């Protein structure tokens, strides 16, 4: 996947702010389980992808991430995300009932200027703290790469792509009942 190609023309403070604020707004939605409103932020052409990651020798570094013809943790369009939302809000979805207590701590937000006006590629680091039941604690760290198109919504933006690069080979958690 390589180093995020940040724009050398450092993004405007005005926009830098509303992009970060959007993510914080989005984080607030996810941790408070407002799934209906969080889904609405995803455009029709959305690609929700989270590849597998492997231990590779330096000489075989290009094969670290699973490809677009491989299995992955997540590889979702619009109708596939829709299905997950139906489950995650469901009363008979017992992986999230009782609900988990989660924290989406978000920083390292980089917004990228493209040629298209009102479209900006966005990188972010995250730590996701998952506590559930009595004593289960799952800690996740990684990055999220997004496109983001300027919209007239409550959060100010819509998501048309999300790639989650997780910092794990074998997943130390029993499941991924949460959203990243």
């Amino acid at each position: 996947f390589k180093t995020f190609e940040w724009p050398s023309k450092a993004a405007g403070l005005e926009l830098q702010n509303e992009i970060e604020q959007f993510y914080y707004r989005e984080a607030q939605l996810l941790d408070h389980r407002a799934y209906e409103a969080w889904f609405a932020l995803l455009d029709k052409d959305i690609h929700y992808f989270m590849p597998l990651r492997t231990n590779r020798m330096i000489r075989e570094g290009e094969l670290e991430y699973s490809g677009d013809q491989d299995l992955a943790h997540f590889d979702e369009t619009h109708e596939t995300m829709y299905g997950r939302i139906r489950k995650v809000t469901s009363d008979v979805g017992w992986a999230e009932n009782p609900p988990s207590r989660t924290r989406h701590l978000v920083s390292n937000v980089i917004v990228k200027e493209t040629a298209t006006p009102d479209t900006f590629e966005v990188n972010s680091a995250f730590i996701l703290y998952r506590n559930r039941l009595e004593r289960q604690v799952d800690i996740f760290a990684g990055e999220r790469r997004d496109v983001l198109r300027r919209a007239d919504n409550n959060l100010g933006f819509s998501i048309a792509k999300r790639t989650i690069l997780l910092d794990a080979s074998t997943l130390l958690s029993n499941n991924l009942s949460m959203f990243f």
Binding site: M57, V92, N175
Partner: protein
């Protein structure tokens, strides 16, 4: 010390009873390493994982780290990933291609066969042919690679027995055969392997009731809900004559498969020239592959698959209280591009750690093992009586011992075979 009598009391296949200590006891686990895992045929993957010379895959046999590697002569060798000098790991990556294997500690060099070829300062300071990593027996069944430490254990074909026709449902549909989609998803569940081994062996009962109500809802059209989606009922359950293998499937009910795999995969599986060629190839026992929808199977002890969905996995034990799930997806090598892609999409969507079906699976398993820390939770036996005395060996539709889909005869036999493996020291009595 666990006496042979004590083991036999842990499983009662006649009364359909289960002593809950088998999921929790520490000393029973360490015996499992020897008695079960140290002499069973264990899934390491598919031939397509290691398609060329020198291609390797670091995997496990129980808790033993192993290297599976394709040779010059197109054979697959499996050896212990352990420098016999001071125990260092010889192969330190997950997967790739090697011309050699070198120990990072003191520089002992190995060939792809696992033969020791070079020792630094050997002339200045014993036979290399005697000091290579320990080798395992390697056998394949229609694409799947199995391995075994015990030279005295039966071969793979005899090990499987009449469970082979149900394996064939997934593996033998076309002469071109199966090929793995790239990627080996791995996650850790704090539950014992037997819970998961059992589920795919016998427990269709969980999918047709409550566990997968939400995953079904994810694979149903937005305009439609859970009421307007019958809850499969009719179907069968198979037990292998020896080995504690078991399968289960629905008959004439596409609702279970349609939800999971969509319209296009179902059409490929049940209709057209491909599904006809599949039934053509499997006419050796006269079983209709068109009518068998949403199958589940476990090959003892830790291999599990879902022929219709085409997901396959190994449960790696890590003590009484945790396992590592290593899973991949299979497709017919000749299938169309759209069919293969739909297989890939729908497997990621449904059976990975974040899969709308698989999420609920672990959630149940985690909770059981947690409760099993209790003394009273380990005091009274568990129930495994479903389908007791409702199966015979003679059906014009299915070969071997066949009962109702929501039975637990296959489960009883799995624990029965486990019980036998734990208690019988010599293969002179264990073998069929």
């Amino acid at each position: 010390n666990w006496t042979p009598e004590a083991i036999r009391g842990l499983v009662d296949q006649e009364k359909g009873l289960l002593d809950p200590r088998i999921y929790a006891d520490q000393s029973l686990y360490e015996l499992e390493l020897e008695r079960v895992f140290g002499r069973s045929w264990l899934l390491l993957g598919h031939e397509s994982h290691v398609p060329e010379t020198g291609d390797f895959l670091a995997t496990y046999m129980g808790e033993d780290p192993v290297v599976m590697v394709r040779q010059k002569d197109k054979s697959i060798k499996v050896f212990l990933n352990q420098c016999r000098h001071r125990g260092m790991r010889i192969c330190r990556s997950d997967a790739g291609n090697a011309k050699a294997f070198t120990c990072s500690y003191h520089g002992w060099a190995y060939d792809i066969a696992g033969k020791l070829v070079n020792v630094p300062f050997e002339k200045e300071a014993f036979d290399k042919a005697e000091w290579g990593p320990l080798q395992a027996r390697v056998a394949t069944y229609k694409g799947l690679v199995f391995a075994n430490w015990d030279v005295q254990a039966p071969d793979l074909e005899t090990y499987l027995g009449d469970a082979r026709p149900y394996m064939d449902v997934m593996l033998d549909r076309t002469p071109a055969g199966t090929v793995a989609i790239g990627g080996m998803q791995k996650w850790v569940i704090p539950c014992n392997w037997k819970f998961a081994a059992e589920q795919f062996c016998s427990d269709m009962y969980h999918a047709g009731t409550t566990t997968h109500l939400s995953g079904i809802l994810a694979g149903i059209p937005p305009e439609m809900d859970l009421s307007q989606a019958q809850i499969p009922t009719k179907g069968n359950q198979f037990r292998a004559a020896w080995g504690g293998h078991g399968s289960g499937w629905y008959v004439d009910e596409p609702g279970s498969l349609l939800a999971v795999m969509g319209p296009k995969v179902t059409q490929y599986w049940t209709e057209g020239p491909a599904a006809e060629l599949a039934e053509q190839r499997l006419g050796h026992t006269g079983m209709p592959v068109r009518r068998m929808v949403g199958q589940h199977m476990t090959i003892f002890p830790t291999c599990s698959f879902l022929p219709g969905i085409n997901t396959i996995r190994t449960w790696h034990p890590r003590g009484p209280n945790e396992i590592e799930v290593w899973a991949f997806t299979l497709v017919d090598a000749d299938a169309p591009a759209e069919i293969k892609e739909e297989y890939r999409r729908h497997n990621i969507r449904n059976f990975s750690a974040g899969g709308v079906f698989e999420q609920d699976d672990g959630e149940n398993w985690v909770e059981i093992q947690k409760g099993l820390r209790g003394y009273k939770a380990k005091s009274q036996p568990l129930n495994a009586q479903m389908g007791l005395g409702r199966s015979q060996t003679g059906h014009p539709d299915f070969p071997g011992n066949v009962g109702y889909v929501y039975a637990e005869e296959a489960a009883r036999g799995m624990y029965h075979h486990w019980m036998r493996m734990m208690s019988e020291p010599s293969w002179a009595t264990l073998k069929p």
